[PDB]
Amino acid sequence: GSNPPPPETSNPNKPKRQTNQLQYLLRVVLKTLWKHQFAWPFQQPVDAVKLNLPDYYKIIKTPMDMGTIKKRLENNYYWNAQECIQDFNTMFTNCYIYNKPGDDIVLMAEALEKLFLQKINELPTEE
Ligand SMILES: COc1ccc(Br)cc1S(=O)(=O)Nc1cc2c(C)noc2cc1C
Numbered sequence: 001g002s003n004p005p006p007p008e009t010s011n012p013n014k015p016k017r018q019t020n021q022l023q024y025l026l027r028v029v030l031k032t033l034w035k036h037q038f039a040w041p042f043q044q045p046v047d048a049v050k051l052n053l054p055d056y057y058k059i060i061k062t063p064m065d066m067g068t069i070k071k072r073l074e075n076n077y078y079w080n081a082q083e084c085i086q087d088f089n090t091m092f093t094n095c096y097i098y099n100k101p102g103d104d105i106v107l108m109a110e111a112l113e114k115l116f117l118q119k120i121n122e123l124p125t126e127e
Pocket residue numbers: 041042046051053095098099104105108
């Protein structure tokens with residue numbers, strides 16, 4: 001099999017803006033997760049060829065990863081924080097759907113998600 005094209009990170013036609021919440025999502029939330037020991041499987045799109053996962057994109061039709069999120073935040077791709085939060089949720093959910101409870105990778109996703117939710121509790125109010 002082949003890999004699909006990765007998710008877009010800019011789109012002229014998609015409404016986009018900067019908000020202080022989205023700034024916080026990049027500067028604090030993404031940065032804290034990116035540097036965590038458990039970040040490595042989630043720092044780029046799943047490469048189903050190199051990782052030998054020929055069923056991955058048979059099961060997962062809405063892929064998402066932190067590399068894509070980082071680029072989207074750097075490009076001010078989002079209209080609001082909720083759109084960015086939804087991308088993180090998709091990334092975690094995909095891991096839980098494709099794998100099994102207790103799997104090494106699921107336990108890592110669960111730890112990152114816990115940290116994510118802690119950091120998102122301190123999301124400042126919007127301007
Ligand atoms: C067998 O490959 C493993 C085993 C344990 C861990 Br933790 C990670 C891998 S892997 O080489 O990153 N392959 C892999 C990646 C993902 C991603 C991303 N989402 O679900 C996955 C499942 C596997 C096996």
